[PDB]
Amino acid sequence: DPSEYCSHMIGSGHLQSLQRLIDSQMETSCQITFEFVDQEQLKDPVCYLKKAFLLVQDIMEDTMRFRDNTPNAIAIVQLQELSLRLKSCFTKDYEEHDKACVRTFYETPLQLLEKVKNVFNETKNLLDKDWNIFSKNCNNSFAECSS
Amino acid sequence: DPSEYCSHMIGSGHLQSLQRLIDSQMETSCQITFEFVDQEQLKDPVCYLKKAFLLVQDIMEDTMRFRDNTPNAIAIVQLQELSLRLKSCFTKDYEEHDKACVRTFYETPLQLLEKVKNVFNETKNLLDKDWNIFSKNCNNSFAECS
Amino acid sequence: DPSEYCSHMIGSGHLQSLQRLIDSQMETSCQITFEFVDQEQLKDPVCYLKKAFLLVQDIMEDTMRFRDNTPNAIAIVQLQELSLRLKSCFTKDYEEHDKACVRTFYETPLQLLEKVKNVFNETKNLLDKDWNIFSKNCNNSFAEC
Amino acid sequence: DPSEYCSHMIGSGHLQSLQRLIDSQMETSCQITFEFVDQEQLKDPVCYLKKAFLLVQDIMEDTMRFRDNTPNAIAIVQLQELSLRLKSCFTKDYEEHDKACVRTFYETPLQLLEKVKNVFNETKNLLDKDWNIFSKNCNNSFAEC
Amino acid sequence: DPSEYCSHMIGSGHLQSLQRLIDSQMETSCQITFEFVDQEQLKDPVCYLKKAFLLVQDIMEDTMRFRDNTPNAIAIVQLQELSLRLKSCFTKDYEEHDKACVRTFYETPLQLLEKVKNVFNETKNLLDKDWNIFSKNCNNSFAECS
Amino acid sequence: DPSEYCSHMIGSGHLQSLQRLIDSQMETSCQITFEFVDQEQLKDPVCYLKKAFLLVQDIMEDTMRFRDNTPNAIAIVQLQELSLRLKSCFTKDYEEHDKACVRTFYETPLQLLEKVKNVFNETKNLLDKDWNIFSKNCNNSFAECSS
Amino acid sequence: AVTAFLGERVTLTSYWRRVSLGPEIEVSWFKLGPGEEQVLIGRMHHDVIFIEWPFRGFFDIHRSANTFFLVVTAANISHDGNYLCRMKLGETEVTKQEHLSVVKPLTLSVHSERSQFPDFSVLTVTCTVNAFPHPHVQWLMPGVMKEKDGSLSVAVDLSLPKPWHLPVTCVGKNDKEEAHGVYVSGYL
Amino acid sequence: AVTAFLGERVTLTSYWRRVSLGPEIEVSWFKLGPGEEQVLIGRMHHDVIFIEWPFRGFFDIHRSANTFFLVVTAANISHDGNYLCRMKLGETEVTKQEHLSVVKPLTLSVHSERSQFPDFSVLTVTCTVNAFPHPHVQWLMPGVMKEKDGSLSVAVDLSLPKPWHLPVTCVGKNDKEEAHGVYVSGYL
Amino acid sequence: AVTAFLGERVTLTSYWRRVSLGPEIEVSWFKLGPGEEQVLIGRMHHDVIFIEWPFRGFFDIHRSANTFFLVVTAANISHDGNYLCRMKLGETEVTKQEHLSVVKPLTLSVHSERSQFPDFSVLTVTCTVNAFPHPHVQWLMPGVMKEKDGSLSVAVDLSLPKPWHLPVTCVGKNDKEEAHGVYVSGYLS
Amino acid sequence: AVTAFLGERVTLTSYWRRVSLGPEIEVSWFKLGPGEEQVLIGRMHHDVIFIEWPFRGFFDIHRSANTFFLVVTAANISHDGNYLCRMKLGETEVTKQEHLSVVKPLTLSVHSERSQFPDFSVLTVTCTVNAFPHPHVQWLMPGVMKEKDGSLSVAVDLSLPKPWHLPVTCVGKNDKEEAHGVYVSGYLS
Amino acid sequence: AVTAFLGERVTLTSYWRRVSLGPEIEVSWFKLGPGEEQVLIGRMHHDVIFIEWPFRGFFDIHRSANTFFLVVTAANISHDGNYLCRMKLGETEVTKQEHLSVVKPLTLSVHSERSQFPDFSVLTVTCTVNAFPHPHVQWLMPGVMKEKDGSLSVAVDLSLPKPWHLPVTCVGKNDKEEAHGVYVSGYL
Amino acid sequence: AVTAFLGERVTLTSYWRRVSLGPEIEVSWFKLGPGEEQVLIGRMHHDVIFIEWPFRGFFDIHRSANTFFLVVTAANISHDGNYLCRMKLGETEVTKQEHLSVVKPLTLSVHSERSQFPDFSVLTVTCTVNAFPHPHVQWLMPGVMKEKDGSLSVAVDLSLPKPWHLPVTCVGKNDKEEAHGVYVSGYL
Numbered sequence A, F: 001d002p003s004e005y006c007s008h009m010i011g012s013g014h015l016q017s018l019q020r021l022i023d024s025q026m027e028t029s030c031q032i033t034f035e036f037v038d039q040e041q042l043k044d045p046v047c048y049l050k051k052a053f054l055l056v057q058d059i060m061e062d063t064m065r066f067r068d069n070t071p072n073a074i075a076i077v078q079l080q081e082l083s084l085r086l087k088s089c090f091t092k093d094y095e096e097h098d099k100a101c102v103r104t105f106y107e108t109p110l111q112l113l114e115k116v117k118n119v120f121n122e123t124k125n126l127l128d129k130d131w132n133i134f135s136k137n138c139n140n141s142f143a144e145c146s147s
Numbered sequence B, E: 001d002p003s004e005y006c007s008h009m010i011g012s013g014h015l016q017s018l019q020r021l022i023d024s025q026m027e028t029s030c031q032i033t034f035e036f037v038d039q040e041q042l043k044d045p046v047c048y049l050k051k052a053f054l055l056v057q058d059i060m061e062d063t064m065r066f067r068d069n070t071p072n073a074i075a076i077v078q079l080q081e082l083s084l085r086l087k088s089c090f091t092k093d094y095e096e097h098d099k100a101c102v103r104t105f106y107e108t109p110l111q112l113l114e115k116v117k118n119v120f121n122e123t124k125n126l127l128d129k130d131w132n133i134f135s136k137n138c139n140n141s142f143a144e145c146s
Numbered sequence C, D: 001d002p003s004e005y006c007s008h009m010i011g012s013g014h015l016q017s018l019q020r021l022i023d024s025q026m027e028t029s030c031q032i033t034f035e036f037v038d039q040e041q042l043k044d045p046v047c048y049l050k051k052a053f054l055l056v057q058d059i060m061e062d063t064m065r066f067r068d069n070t071p072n073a074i075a076i077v078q079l080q081e082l083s084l085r086l087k088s089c090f091t092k093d094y095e096e097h098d099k100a101c102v103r104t105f106y107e108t109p110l111q112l113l114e115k116v117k118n119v120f121n122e123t124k125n126l127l128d129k130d131w132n133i134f135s136k137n138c139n140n141s142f143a144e145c
Numbered sequence G, H, K, L: 001a002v003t004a005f006l007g008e009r010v011t012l013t014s015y016w017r018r019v020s021l022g023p024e025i026e027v028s029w030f031k032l033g034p035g036e037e038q039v040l041i042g043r044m045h046h047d048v049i050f051i052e053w054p055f056r057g058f059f060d061i062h063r064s065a066n067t068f069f070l071v072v073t074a075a076n077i078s079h080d081g082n083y084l085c086r087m088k089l090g091e092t093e094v095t096k097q098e099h100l101s102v103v104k105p106l107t108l109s110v111h112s113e114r115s116q117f118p119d120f121s122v123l124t125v126t127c128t129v130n131a132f133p134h135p136h137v138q139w140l141m142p143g144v145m146k147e148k149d150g151s152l153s154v155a156v157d158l159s160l161p162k163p164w165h166l167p168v169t170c171v172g173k174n175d176k177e178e179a180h181g182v183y184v185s186g187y188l
Numbered sequence I, J: 001a002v003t004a005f006l007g008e009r010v011t012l013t014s015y016w017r018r019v020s021l022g023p024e025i026e027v028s029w030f031k032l033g034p035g036e037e038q039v040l041i042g043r044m045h046h047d048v049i050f051i052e053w054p055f056r057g058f059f060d061i062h063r064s065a066n067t068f069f070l071v072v073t074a075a076n077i078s079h080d081g082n083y084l085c086r087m088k089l090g091e092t093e094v095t096k097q098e099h100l101s102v103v104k105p106l107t108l109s110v111h112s113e114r115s116q117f118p119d120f121s122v123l124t125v126t127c128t129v130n131a132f133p134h135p136h137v138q139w140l141m142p143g144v145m146k147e148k149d150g151s152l153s154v155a156v157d158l159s160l161p162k163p164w165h166l167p168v169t170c171v172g173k174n175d176k177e178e179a180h181g182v183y184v185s186g187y188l189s
């Protein structure tokens, strides 16, 4: 169900826009909590990114809010649109692993943004090499959590 | 020592840059403490701005920090330079009134930005009407604080 | 069942004898308690007098005591007779009011005597004027107490 | 400084008037307190009488009070005169004994009157017999109190 | 069952042996407890001895112990044998009176020995006067104990 | 100052008499306290006996009492007499060692008597071999107490 | 009558009708418990007076002429109620019953307290009335506690939301006794 | 006089000489402390009686005719001493002084105890007298302690060696008051 | 200006001026005593908080962003007064002062008492105010006591001869806080 | 028969019959309780003594020769009663019983009181005896209370009408122990 | 975790998922108890915090951004257990459960006692461990008291006859916590 | 010796040198104190024993033959010290001095505590020794409290930074008495 166009969804436009969010934020000593997959439990590079990327999408609406019609709001609208188009690029794993490998972080908005950008950057690189990479059965990796 | 020139310093480019700082901030329930002019104590519009302006430079440096050569960082650099130019336009009031009319706020970064945008904006507008407006003697209004 | 007898039932000799009692008592600060008619409760002079009269009978027996055959004892015996002669000149009022308008007093023997004398003195005055005065229905007066 | 006057200084009219006081008082349980001579301390009849006499003067003023011009008031005024006439028939004894043999009593007005009457009644008796009887030196009697 | 013979059993040899037990004991302030007849309760001389004698055998065995074939040990052996012979001379009184008239003493060994010497000595003397003396009926005297 | 007659003072008569005391005592569980030299502190055979014997003499009057004119009283009188005659047989040591090597015992009169008899028996044996034995300077032994 | 306030000296009286008499009457006082139940306080005969130990110092008795007095030295709440005086001469007895009312004057208190959740906008004003016999509280609009001394306390709360409509008045009552507490302004 | 025993009701009296008067006299009672020192107990004028709080319930006052009474409800030892009654009519004053004697009847006790060293042969008999004002003890032959109630206790010991010469008598006294304690035989 | 009522939770703040800083600031809160003395309440550094034992449970400290909170968990009268917050980054120290006002809402009471000698005709009405900081009472005409909780009580008497001039008004004050007491009628006619 | 007075040291003994024995006997002393029950006071064997904790300081045990002593250090009323001593040598056991009598010397008191109603003429003289075991009181003519120390108190009243027949004699008893109380004269004439 | 030691300040956290919300969320923290009851600790809404009176001074609550903190000011043993945070935004409620482990570090004690009967030759040595939650003691071979502070104590005895095999070792544990007691020699 | 442990029955002895005497000797035992005072414990003569009231139940005295015994029924720390027995026969007195050592066996305790500021990385472990007469503690390296019972407590702290060098050993001593405490691991 993944096909060749999976290599040609995430563009440099999306990434540049992610850098924009980061570059525009005021530096504060301020912290929010959010979920994210922890790299200490999910070490396999493909599966970490597979899970991570899907998590970033369904966390986006709650964690990445800007005023409507603003450049960053528009950037977020485009990432979300892009998520829907990536649908068939990730094959589903066992639903028992939905809450698996996930953890909360009490960090800065800038630090949230760094994480999201890197998941994006790395998910794009993988897809550019192999449009079929995320058809990987990730169940064994997900079960290894919480190790 | 103010002059006609004062009417020509705060351009609408500055104000759009302030709006871009605002529009680009991510929405959190995050709050920060900063010191600013008490609008409950300084009601007089001219005197409020005279005071706000003597705080705006330090406010910027300590509260509005961006990564270098970033658009928002550059905007702050240009707002800093503007504030040197505008020096000429405000006549000094008694030093006894340096810490008067001031208040801490526990507010959102977006709310800080809006306060700052408003100073510049009203300072522009007042100055568009009268290049000499901020040569007002504000010693009495300051004394009425608290 | 009154008559024109009542006009001069109480003579001046009856009054002199009362004043004799008062004149003959020793002045002390002694006080005794006795039941009498309450003048604050019972302001109407006619009904006051009628009430007082149904009491001076017992009052005299219990409160005004002298040794047999003494001048003052005699004057009491006659005042007992006078009161027995006066039972027709006052008509009866509802028995429900037998204890009404009555009150104890903690007073001097002489003060008691002043009270008792004035019942007779004031009765005689009104009785000199109208002999039928104590046919007055006092049921309402007594009822106000 | 006695004489044969003293034999009949106190008449029977003086005694009748005393008994009149007693007869005319109301019987109550009132009690008053008064100083009189102590009969347990001072048993000798002659000296008792002498002592009592130096007291009935004041006793009467403070204890036997009646309104001016009353029969009983008059009888007191005369008993005051009688006592002033009797000051010669008793000779003085040491002043050191002015408070001796004396005692307060918490008693009835009538009981006081009985006391005062007996001073006069018993004085008269002894005075009828011997007119010079109260020239008796009572210094020793009083001293025994 | 007593007879003339009873007058001839306690010899003065026995009594000298008892005196040798006494004379040979070292003087200490040592005290021992033993049970004996209460002289305060049995005053009667004959009855006292009748009773003392029913105790003397056990008293000896438990209280007067010497090393074997020693002179004092031999003396005790001969006093034991004498007591068997003297059995005949005492008639038995009610068994109800076996524990009556008895008392514990907390005394010196020398004082124990003296009590024992006295029983034998007075028993000898009484028996010298009347071979039949200890056929006395002592049931009443015993009953008066306590 | 000791001479040959020191071999011929303590006779078998004295010893037999000591046995008599022992043999005549009633057996009791009774105890007295007395001083005696302890064999644990004074191990040297000669010096133990030298000290022991002298101690037995000046303890005799207080610990070994019988009624006057009794055979055992007479025995004790003779031991005491014998002590005076033995005077020059024991040469004196340093007076600082008077209280040395001595100890109390809480024992039976029979046990006291056993000890005394053995000191006697052994002191006699030594003297029979050497009338001069107790001229031994015992100061070194006495100083070793309390070891 | 009679009425005494808490802490006051008060007397109840009785008397012998024959004015000629006094000391010869055997007089006994009773405090009437609840109910059909009489408790001896004290007796008086021939000027000898004996007060039962439980009432000793709280009550006394004396006579003047034909008149007999029951004195309460310092009225307390327990003393409130009926009394019986039995008067006995030889074989003949007359009894007088008397009622004594003991009153404690009221104490009215007002205080306020603001809310701590969900905000500080709600002002609760509390009005307390202590009294005997009949404490009564109420707030004028746009249970009972027994104290150690026998008196009664009652309290009412009034909650005001923003903006507080001050002043507010509570009326406190005993019977005819009346006091007000008025809360006029908060501290801010 | 007067004399009261501990716990008894007792009255001190005073009076106005003019028999005609009574309620009009201002009467005040004082307990006289040591010394030249007067302490107000209570006042009476026109039949209003007020007792000072420290004496409330221990003293009361009443009047009959010209006669004034100071009643002590239950005499205690502190009440023993002098009293002053000041009587005031207009500008004129007369004072009466009265003495009150309070007596506590004596309690005599006897007990014995034998020695425990050097032997049990010595019998010590102890006689104790409690009283007010004047307890006194003594053994008939061949200091003071103040109690909480204000009374005094005194004790004497008698030691008997063997053979004990029993019985032995101690006499206890208050003033004229006298009791004996006699120890007749030991327990053995 | 921060004011708390007795029993309330209340918060005092200080802050680091550079908004991007927070956990790096060593923070110590002091209660200022009457000799200008500093008593250490507690310290904070990198979101590790330690509250001195005499203050434990009465005060707490937390941070959010560049802001440093002193929480008093239940304001009591002792807590009224000044506080000092010392903030250090490396060699640089800045201090902030904060005054806390603790207020106890006033209680106003009215009661009366009639005289017992020479007669019963004088009515004495009493008005009492308890409060903190400044209780004040006063009768309107035609000594300060210290309580165990730290509050102050004041009382005034008004003696009225017969016939009693009633009603009578009593005015009580804390600062701006105000209550009235009215004695309207006595118990007997 | 052994008797001790309250507060006295007192000794009870048992013994081994064979006089040459002593330290070898295992000795245990018991206090007998009201159900014939044995409560262990303490044990002794080879001059090692152990006293049970509830009895420590109140009882001690020692031996001399064949004799075994139970020392009660200060006799109190609870100690009155029986004791049992069990002695064992190997399989052979013998027991001795001992009763201890504890006695408290009697206290006799006299006091009086006159009546207060209907008059002061009746004199009531009171005689009281405290003791243990058997206090007894009695007035000579022309309920038992339990004290905290275990002793017993008894009292009798004698009411005398006027004129008072004085002197009056009171006789108190423990057992053989005897005291008299005489009331000789009252305070007033 | 989270684990706290006795006396430590410790913190439980919860959060709202929409990062832009904070004060709007109605927050309430509950201590969960045997076995389904929830006891309200306190509430927070719009930065108004009210801690229920029983938990006052023991617990506090504050907000940071979208993050909510339960502070337990000095962990005591009663605080060991589950907690529930209830977050409400109008109609939506989300719930978070959180467990706190309170731990009391172990105390190990050793002391000896020689026997007193029938002789003094037996040494019994005692090892005591107090901890929370799981104290456990034992002797290495050749009765649970519950304390006031909620902690548990256990003790073991070892009896050595002569001659004593010293040294002897006791082992005390909590969970992973371990200490030893060694008795090396007696006093003599 | 003689040495006794806390709580033990112990015995001091004295004797008369003439073995035939016993009861005749007047015996008295004294506790010697700071620094020359002699306090009479009790007396014995002719088998009569009297123990002074302050020592009653703590000490007793008895005789055997010529031998005299002081029993201290339950050795407590105050009993540690010198004793004097005075023996008198008419004119002759002989004296004997005797020392009693009371010993309380040591208790050794170990427990740990992690730091709370500026972080939780420091472990300080505490070792406590209570004994009599000479408690002494120390840590083997890679403040004397006096108790109610007269015994002494001492304590030492050791502070370990991360990473903790466990196990660590504490050494506790009395005199020849020795125990060790070993902290093997923390809880985590």
Ligand SMILES: *[C@@H]1O[C@H](CO)[C@@H](O[C@@H]2O[C@H](CO)[C@@H](O[C@@H]3O[C@H](CO)[C@@H](O)[C@H](O)[C@@H]3O)[C@H](O)[C@H]2NC(C)=O)[C@H](O)[C@H]1NC(C)=O
Pocket: G054, G055, G058, G076, G077, G078, G079, G148, G149, G150
């Ligand atoms: C109000 O007045 C009554 C009396 O009319 C008070 O009751 C009395 O209070 C006294 C104590 O002051 C009681 O006496 C006590 O009795 C106990 C126990 O029986 C005794 O142990 C004490 O030594 C003491 O004598 C007395 O019994 C009691 N009288 C009655 C009739 O109950 C009452 O206390 C007063 N109430 C208040 C709040 O003041």
